[PDB]
Amino acid sequence: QNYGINLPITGSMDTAYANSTQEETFLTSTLCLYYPTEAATEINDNSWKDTLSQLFLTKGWPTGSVYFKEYTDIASFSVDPQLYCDYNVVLMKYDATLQLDMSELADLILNEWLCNPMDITLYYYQQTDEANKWISMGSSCTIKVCPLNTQTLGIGCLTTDTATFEEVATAEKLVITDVVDGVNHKLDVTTATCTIRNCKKLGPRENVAVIQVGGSDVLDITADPTTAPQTERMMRINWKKWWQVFYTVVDYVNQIIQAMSKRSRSLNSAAFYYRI
Amino acid sequence: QNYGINLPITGSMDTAYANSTQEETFLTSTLCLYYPTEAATEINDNSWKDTLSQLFLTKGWPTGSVYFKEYTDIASFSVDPQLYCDYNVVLMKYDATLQLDMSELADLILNEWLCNPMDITLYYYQQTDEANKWISMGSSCTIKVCPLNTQTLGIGCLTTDTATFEEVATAEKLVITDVVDGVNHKLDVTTATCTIRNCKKLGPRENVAVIQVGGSDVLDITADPTTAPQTERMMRINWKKWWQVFYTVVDYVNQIIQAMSKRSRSLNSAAFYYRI
Amino acid sequence: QNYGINLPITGSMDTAYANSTQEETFLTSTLCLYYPTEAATEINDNSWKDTLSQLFLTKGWPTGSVYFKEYTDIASFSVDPQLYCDYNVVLMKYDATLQLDMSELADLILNEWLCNPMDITLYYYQQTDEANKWISMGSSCTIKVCPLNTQTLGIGCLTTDTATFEEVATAEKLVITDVVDGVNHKLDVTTATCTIRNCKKLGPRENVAVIQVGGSDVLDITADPTTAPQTERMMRINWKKWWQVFYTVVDYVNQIIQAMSKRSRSLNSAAFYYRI
Amino acid sequence: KSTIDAAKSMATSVMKKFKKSGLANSVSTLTDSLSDAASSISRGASIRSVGSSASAWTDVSTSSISTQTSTISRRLRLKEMATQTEGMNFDDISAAVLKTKIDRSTQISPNTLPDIVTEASEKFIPNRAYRVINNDEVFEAGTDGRFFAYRVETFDEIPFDVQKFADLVTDSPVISAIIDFKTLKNLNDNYGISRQQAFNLLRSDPRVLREFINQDNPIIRNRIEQLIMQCRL
Amino acid sequence: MDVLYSLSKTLKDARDKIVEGTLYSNVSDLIQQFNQMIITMNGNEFQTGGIGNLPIRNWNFDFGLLGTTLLNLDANYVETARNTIDYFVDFVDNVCMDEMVRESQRNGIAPQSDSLRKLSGIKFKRINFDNSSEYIENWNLQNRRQRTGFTFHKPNIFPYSASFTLNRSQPAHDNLMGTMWLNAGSEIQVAGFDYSCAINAPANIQQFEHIVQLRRVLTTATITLLPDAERFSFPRVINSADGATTWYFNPVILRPNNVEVEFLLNGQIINTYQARFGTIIARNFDTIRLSFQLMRPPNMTPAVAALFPNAQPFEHHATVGLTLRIESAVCESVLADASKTMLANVTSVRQEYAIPVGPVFPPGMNWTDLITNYSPSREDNLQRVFTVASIRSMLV
Amino acid sequence: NGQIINTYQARFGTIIARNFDTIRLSFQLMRPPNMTPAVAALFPNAQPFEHHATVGLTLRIESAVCESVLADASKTMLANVTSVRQEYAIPVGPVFPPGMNWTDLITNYSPSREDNLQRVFTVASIRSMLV
Amino acid sequence: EYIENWNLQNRRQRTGFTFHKPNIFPYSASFTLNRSQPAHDNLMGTMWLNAGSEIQVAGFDYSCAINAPANIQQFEHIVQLRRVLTTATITLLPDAERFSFPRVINSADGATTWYFNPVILRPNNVEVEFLLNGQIINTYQARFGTIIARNFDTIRLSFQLMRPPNMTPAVAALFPNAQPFEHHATVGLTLRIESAVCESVLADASKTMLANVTSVRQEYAIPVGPVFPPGMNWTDLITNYSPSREDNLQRVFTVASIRSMLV
Amino acid sequence: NGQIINTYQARFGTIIARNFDTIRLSFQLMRPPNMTPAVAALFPNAQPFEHHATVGLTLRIESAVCESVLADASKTMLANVTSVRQEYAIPVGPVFPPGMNWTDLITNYSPSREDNLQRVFTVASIRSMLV
Numbered sequence A, B, C: 001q002n003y004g005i006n007l008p009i010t011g012s013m014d015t016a017y018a019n020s021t022q023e024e025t026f027l028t029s030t031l032c033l034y035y036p037t038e039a040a041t042e043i044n045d046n047s048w049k050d051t052l053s054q055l056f057l058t059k060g061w062p063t064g065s066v067y068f069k070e071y072t073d074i075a076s077f078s079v080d081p082q083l084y085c086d087y088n089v090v091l092m093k094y095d096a097t098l099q100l101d102m103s104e105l106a107d108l109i110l111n112e113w114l115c116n117p118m119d120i121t122l123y124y125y126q127q128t129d130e131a132n133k134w135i136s137m138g139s140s141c142t143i144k145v146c147p148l149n150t151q152t153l154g155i156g157c158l159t160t161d162t163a164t165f166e167e168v169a170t171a172e173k174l175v176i177t178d179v180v181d182g183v184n185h186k187l188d189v190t191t192a193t194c195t196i197r198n199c200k201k202l203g204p205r206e207n208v209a210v211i212q213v214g215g216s217d218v219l220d221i222t223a224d225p226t227t228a229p230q231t232e233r234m235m236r237i238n239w240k241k242w243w244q245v246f247y248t249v250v251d252y253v254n255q256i257i258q259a260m261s262k263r264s265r266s267l268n269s270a271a272f273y274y275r276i
Numbered sequence D: 001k002s003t004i005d006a007a008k009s010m011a012t013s014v015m016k017k018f019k020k021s022g023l024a025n026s027v028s029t030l031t032d033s034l035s036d037a038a039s040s041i042s043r044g045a046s047i048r049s050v051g052s053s054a055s056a057w058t059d060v061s062t063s064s065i066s067t068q069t070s071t072i073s074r075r076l077r078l079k080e081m082a083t084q085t086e087g088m089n090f091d092d093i094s095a096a097v098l099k100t101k102i103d104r105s106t107q108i109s110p111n112t113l114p115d116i117v118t119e120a121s122e123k124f125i126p127n128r129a130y131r132v133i134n135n136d137e138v139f140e141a142g143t144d145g146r147f148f149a150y151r152v153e154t155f156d157e158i159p160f161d162v163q164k165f166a167d168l169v170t171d172s173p174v175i176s177a178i179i180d181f182k183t184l185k186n187l188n189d190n191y192g193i194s195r196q197q198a199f200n201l202l203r204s205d206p207r208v209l210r211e212f213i214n215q216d217n218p219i220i221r222n223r224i225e226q227l228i229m230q231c232r233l
Numbered sequence E: 001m002d003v004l005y006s007l008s009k010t011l012k013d014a015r016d017k018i019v020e021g022t023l024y025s026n027v028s029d030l031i032q033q034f035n036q037m038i039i040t041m042n043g044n045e046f047q048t049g050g051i052g053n054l055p056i057r058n059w060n061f062d063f064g065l066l067g068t069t070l071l072n073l074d075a076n077y078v079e080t081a082r083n084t085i086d087y088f089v090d091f092v093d094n095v096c097m098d099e100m101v102r103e104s105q106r107n108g109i110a111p112q113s114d115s116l117r118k119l120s121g122i123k124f125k126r127i128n129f130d131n132s133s134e135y136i137e138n139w140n141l142q143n144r145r146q147r148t149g150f151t152f153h154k155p156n157i158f159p160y161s162a163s164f165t166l167n168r169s170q171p172a173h174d175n176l177m178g179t180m181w182l183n184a185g186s187e188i189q190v191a192g193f194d195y196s197c198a199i200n201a202p203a204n205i206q207q208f209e210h211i212v213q214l215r216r217v218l219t220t221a222t223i224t225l226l227p228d229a230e231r232f233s234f235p236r237v238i239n240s241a242d243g244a245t246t247w248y249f250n251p252v253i254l255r256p257n258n259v260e261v262e263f264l265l266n267g268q269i270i271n272t273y274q275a276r277f278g279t280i281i282a283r284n285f286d287t288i289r290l291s292f293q294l295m296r297p298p299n300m301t302p303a304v305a306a307l308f309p310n311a312q313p314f315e316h317h318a319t320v321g322l323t324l325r326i327e328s329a330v331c332e333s334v335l336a337d338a339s340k341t342m343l344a345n346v347t348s349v350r351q352e353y354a355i356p357v358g359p360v361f362p363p364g365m366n367w368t369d370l371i372t373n374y375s376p377s378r379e380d381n382l383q384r385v386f387t388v389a390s391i392r393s394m395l396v
Numbered sequence F, H: 001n002g003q004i005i006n007t008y009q010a011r012f013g014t015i016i017a018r019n020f021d022t023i024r025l026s027f028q029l030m031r032p033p034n035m036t037p038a039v040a041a042l043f044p045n046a047q048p049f050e051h052h053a054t055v056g057l058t059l060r061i062e063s064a065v066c067e068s069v070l071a072d073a074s075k076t077m078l079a080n081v082t083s084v085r086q087e088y089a090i091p092v093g094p095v096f097p098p099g100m101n102w103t104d105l106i107t108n109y110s111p112s113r114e115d116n117l118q119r120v121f122t123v124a125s126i127r128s129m130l131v
Numbered sequence G: 001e002y003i004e005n006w007n008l009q010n011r012r013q014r015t016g017f018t019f020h021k022p023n024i025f026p027y028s029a030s031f032t033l034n035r036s037q038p039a040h041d042n043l044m045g046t047m048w049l050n051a052g053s054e055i056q057v058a059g060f061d062y063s064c065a066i067n068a069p070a071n072i073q074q075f076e077h078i079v080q081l082r083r084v085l086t087t088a089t090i091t092l093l094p095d096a097e098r099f100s101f102p103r104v105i106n107s108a109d110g111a112t113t114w115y116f117n118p119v120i121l122r123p124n125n126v127e128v129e130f131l132l133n134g135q136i137i138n139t140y141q142a143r144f145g146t147i148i149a150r151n152f153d154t155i156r157l158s159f160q161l162m163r164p165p166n167m168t169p170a171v172a173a174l175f176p177n178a179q180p181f182e183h184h185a186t187v188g189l190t191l192r193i194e195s196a197v198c199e200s201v202l203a204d205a206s207k208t209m210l211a212n213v214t215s216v217r218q219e220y221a222i223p224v225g226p227v228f229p230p231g232m233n234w235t236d237l238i239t240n241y242s243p244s245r246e247d248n249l250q251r252v253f254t255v256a257s258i259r260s261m262l263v
């Protein structure tokens, strides 16, 4: 592929529809459902995963392709989220107070990222392009930023006194920081509790779909203020009970995955690619 | 008609536009306004209905054409909704907690349904396709579901023991159950205070419009998670006083009716077509 | 640009040879050295990393391009190794008692693995083809396997009784399990302190080289008994001092990198194949 | 794939659903109609008929010519299940498609093959045409309401003579119009064919069909593709 | 061919000029030519048609001549001539049909039918007279191997081809970059689309190229170039390259930038037109190279800026286009065109009589296959049959 | 005359109709079995349908032969007849539509109209030889 | 024909050249904004292409004539031919497909770009006038298909956008009472001069005179003269079709036809 | 012209291609179903692959007939023309490649190149009759 990536592909506008006769690495695809702990609590059953597997089999998934990854809450799940299956469906319960955290999680898992380590203790860091952000996650991440000028002197802050730095995040399991591009910033972070990386947004993920349970359309997966794209992979439903939500997910799994695309699952389960 | 229903209608692309039929429509039509009790309470006038009728007359409607129906709340209104006039505008107050109930009411009254009886005690019921749902209405509708398998044995549940059933509705006035298609289920419903019907969504009901007073776009009249269509008959307004709401409804009645199509009024006032 | 498709590339057999790119490869890439802790203890110098960086700079690696990583021993390193540098060199000390483990470690890092989750509670698992293995990593992995038959009953084991299961791993930090293909197996694993994944061997990991410091050639990165390939990325050196080992690594870094190639799965051409 | 303990009743398992299906009912109805017509001296006025003689095959009980031909051909469907055809017999095409699919299907099960064979036999090639040849004149009819009359050597359309098609198809060996008249004309115009080739194509002789397919003829290949994609259930 | 053309021309002139009341001075030479034709054809037996459904017809000529001394032609003279004219017209029509339905790989330019082969005998050369039609003039010049060409209005030079090329793509087909074109008859419509609208392209310019190779060298061609391809200007659902899936195209048309049309002959730049629209002249070429660019508007009004965000999703896809119509041209080889009916005549004759497919022409006389593989042998046979078709259309 | 003379299937470049008086075009809209997320987003399973699937077809007769006179692009017979009639304000006659409207003429192309049109077209060509 | 007209011209007699698809309109793709503003969100105007024998025009109103005097917006397009055409047959069609798809169009001065999102309404009260020296020679009202312009030098196309008095909910959703206007109403018109007669020589589709002269000039690298525009560009030639240009063009075209008789 | 004039299946040795302009050679590498221990040792189930399986084909045109002139191993026309051009340092013209190089010439064998080549080759044969 690599030696043929930059080669044209020509197709005729009358070619009859067909289906691939190409082997896949795995015989069948796998579906991962990420649900909150409260969903399992409310369902109050030990065999519910088995029943959901049988219903998915009714929907054409061989026994062994559906996996269920439980997560405590949005904040905890936001710490280095791992996407295991070919298709990932994340059932995010909506909370009116965590709109930014929901947006950050959706941005992280609905987009490919290319990240690098940030030794904030040794170097200042810039954001080169609008696609560049600083993604930090951990047990508790507090980020303080001091913008410098061309002479490497803080603006509105003392480069030596951290108390004058600017607070952009306090006790965050995950936070995507966007600062003015082309400006050197001195950073101090709770490195003992969280890791911060310089990340570049490469594009959509296409194999992770987020279903927002309850609420309204509040996700913003783009840091640009004048855009709030509602892609086909961010769905929204209304609910009173979790069994109905899971039945809806099972019954419309074909529609859910028609909005997603295979070929996007990375070899690693991480939500970002890493370079050191 | 029926002998010409499956016949083509040919028209030329140069036929002159006819004059505005809005006046004739208003003269020969009837308007029904559905509002909650709190609206009347806040107005605190014994002649507000007459005032609104006179204002509608200023807007072209004949005197005895506009009718006003009052409902206690969304949940109360959802028990056998009755749509009387040719045009049915429903002023639905927004509550962040009743989101699913608002969506269910809008789905029931903004669409035409074809319902049949279900004898849950005798037969095992399944949903044939995406248009098939189970609509339950009553004083208290508590629906519990036990999916079965090819051998009729339950999965995650025991047919004999109802306590193992997967509860999907509790203490509901209206509920629209969507289970996995093609799977037989055994249902436990409080038949004493509940009636459950196997319904198919035929299509839009274009003579019913819903104006959501307050909140954001939360209505979801489609069980499919991937789509949440906002139709022309799903209006939303922001309010402080109910008098302003009614004045907006009266002034823009032209636009409200123009978003609705006549001839969709059934002979009966029910929200569904009952067939044995 | 054309990412999801594999297009043939045509080249002439007499075009030219482009200038050496080793200089630029060193300049724009990063090197990682993985060594045991006992190496650091024997060296017994606090600034030895600085000296090695200076020597690598003498060999053309810009300062900061070479990173050093410490692992307590083979068993500890085998717990989910994370090789992130552009070029990875793993100095693995030979212990005659830890042959298989070393092999497994090499098999894990010298090859590219595509892994799906395994829910041993819900599903029975097969191994479809020769490239299919079960890789388990954790604090202590203990895997017992009960093979079944067409009737789903165990062979020489009882599914209900785990005491009859055939133990294949005991207190392993990492283990790669190969079983008979086409036979369903029930797995009993210590999921609390071990995670098992259903993995496929896609191909070689180009950018990881293992230097065996000590005894003879014992590594077997292939489950097939009939073949025990020794690839160019599996180096072997006899040693008495760790400073000598590191000096040999620095002096011949040109050849070590030459034996390695950029990870195909890591660069942009692999986009929408699996990763980047 | 023969999941043993299910092969013990596979043929009978499929037959049990087969005889309860629409094809079996139509066969029974045809046999009963023929028996009543034979038994009836004056009890035959019930038989709508277009031919000069009242026949159950030509019974039309449910353009006028198009409707008559459609009603006749929907029952000529059974001439295939009567061994009263000489061509290549659409039902064998459907049976071959069924065999290939059930052999190449990974989801077919012994409990599903019953009633799958039946809906295949009843929904494979729903609209099919039949032709009758007589003294160099060919009358073709179809379940879709299209009827043609033409000559053998030169496929030139003629006014369709119902009441002559009816009597011809009552007794003459009916032919499955696998290569229908439209495709026959298209072939003879673009690929002007021999007298022997046309003779065999009209009678749906498999040899010429495979000959033309091996030559990679776009027209006959398109016709056969239409038939195969028409073989869905 | 010259003798057959002369027969047809003599019969046409007999129909036109031998009319009641006309002076004999008006038809003296025509009457001499007609009598020569009668004299030469008399005593000769001809056989036409044993291929497909073309029936075997036998022709014998024992016709009397025409008078030469009267002053004005009268109804008697015309009646005498009419029967001979009808028989000869039928004979010539059948000979033309017999020749039109034949081909040979070896010598496609030589006569194939027995009748036309006999008419190539020396004794029939006396029938030959004025060869003034375009096709017969080209026939004679090409036999002498002299530079000669046919003039076509809307030449049918491009085989049908509706295709697309994706330079940037991915399995979800959400951020694409490429070109889609229709090549049909004398028309080329090409459209280069960028889903990102060249947000990340160097200088915010994306370059698209389209190269069309003509199977024959066109000369003295008039071309109409327009800056929009209306064919690729509306939403479409397009099959993928391999037909595995379908992708969505939602064009928003930006004007093309740095438009260059190069008409090349054997890789040599013969004509070049930069930012020129309307009528252009391509004097001599066999290849057309259209290079255009999509440039981001440096300044955008709020709606335009709303169309093109900084990153995905890209809902509106920026498209530039070109339309190139060959109004007229000159080509040394015969082609189908919107004005003449030669291809239609040959195809009709072949279809009406179920001519078996030969070893030269595509079955059904399909023009797309014919012009896709327009070999010298195909060119020879096509010129032969087209000349015969023009000769026949002179009468029929 | 209701008899099928020519048939072309999935052919688009250039076709020949040797003898015909009726054109029957048939085309199918086939929902694509496989859809990318955007395509699948266009076509929901139920109403509302905001994007409507459409399948086109364009058929241009570039050249033909007819035993009856007709207006065409190249010739100026109809233009000449109409111009002469309009210049001298000829009252509407009993045969042709008012203003020599070609749409009405060809919509009701009766034998009498054919005869009169051929006469006037032949005279128009005769005149155009000189003027 | 060319030598006959040459002789007629030499005798100062009436001349006539018959053209199929006469190349009478110089290329010009332009627009006029009768109502505009810096934001370009509520515009009203016309955009047209005049090329060869084809005129496509489209009158667009972003408000869909919501505030018009009678919900009618009047659009006018005047094309002044640079030579008089006689005995012209013209195909007139309702819609202008060239201006019926979304576009991003430069501003008048190029400072910025505006967005066009047409939704096509049928043209109303169509009126095609063919004028000679400012006098109405031909008029056609609500007439489409083939029409005859017997003698004219100007074309006046007057059409109207009439707001539909009745609109289904889908139609009513595109045309709100006030801004923003995401869907912009458009009424088109296509006019093709299939054939005509002109006293002066012109380029056309059928003949090869212009192509021959241009090819001969290009082949031998003839330097630009003092009469014709460089490269024999037809747009420049017919935009400024002066009597000197007419004389020289007739001369070279006649010579070109003479040559084409033999080459 | 894309039509199969000649076909040869598993036939080796001397074959006749009567009339053609394209050659399509289709072959297949088939894994031996049965292998001796050494053969099985060559081809493992996974990487590394030290021995790479290869199938081949050789196709020599011993003799042929062409309507256009060509260079061959017997006639010395190309050599004569090239020698004459090189001896007298003829400047590169507008037709032939700038060495009289046969690869470039036969690559872009245009009709103009074919005409000029036929002329020069005929003159070369005429000259070789004497010189």
Ligand SMILES: *[C@@H]1O[C@H](CO)[C@@H](O)[C@H](O)[C@H]1NC(C)=O
Pocket: B019
């Ligand atoms: C329609 O409106 C026009 C314009 O005012 C008016 O003249 C006419 O009488 C109205 N009624 C009808 C039936 O056209």
Ligand SMILES: *[C@@H]1O[C@H](CO)[C@@H](O)[C@H](O)[C@H]1NC(C)=O
Pocket: C019
């Ligand atoms: C390659 O190396 C040669 C020899 O040192 C040098 O002249 C040249 O500039 C280098 N670069 C390229 C691109 O050839």
Ligand SMILES: [Ca+2]
Pocket: A100, A101, A104, A172, A173, A174, A175
């Ligand atoms: Ca956060």
Ligand SMILES: [Ca+2]
Pocket: A156, A157, A164, A165, A166
């Ligand atoms: Ca500060």
Ligand SMILES: [Ca+2]
Pocket: A127, A129, A130, A132, A178, A179, A180, A181
């Ligand atoms: Ca930034």
Ligand SMILES: [Ca+2]
Pocket: A220, A221, A222, A223, A224, A225, A226, A227, A228
């Ligand atoms: Ca945003």
Ligand SMILES: [Ca+2]
Pocket: B100, B101, B104, B172, B173, B174, B175
């Ligand atoms: Ca409810």
Ligand SMILES: [Ca+2]
Pocket: A045, B156, B157, B164, B165, B166
């Ligand atoms: Ca339960």
Ligand SMILES: [Ca+2]
Pocket: A251, B127, B129, B130, B132, B178, B179, B180, B181
């Ligand atoms: Ca359902």
Ligand SMILES: [Ca+2]
Pocket: A236, B220, B221, B222, B223, B224, B225, B226, B227, B228
């Ligand atoms: Ca929904």
Ligand SMILES: [Ca+2]
Pocket: C100, C101, C104, C172, C173, C174, C175, C176
């Ligand atoms: Ca181990």
Ligand SMILES: [Ca+2]
Pocket: C156, C157, C158, C163, C164, C165, C166
């Ligand atoms: Ca055991």
Ligand SMILES: [Ca+2]
Pocket: C127, C129, C130, C132, C178, C179, C180, C181
């Ligand atoms: Ca195995």
Ligand SMILES: [Ca+2]
Pocket: C220, C221, C222, C223, C224, C225, C226, C227, C228, C229
């Ligand atoms: Ca091994």
Ligand SMILES: [Cl-]
Pocket: E154, E338, F073, G021, G205
């Ligand atoms: Cl034209």
Ligand SMILES: [Zn+2]
Pocket: E153, E154, E338, F073, G020, G021, G205
């Ligand atoms: Zn034309």
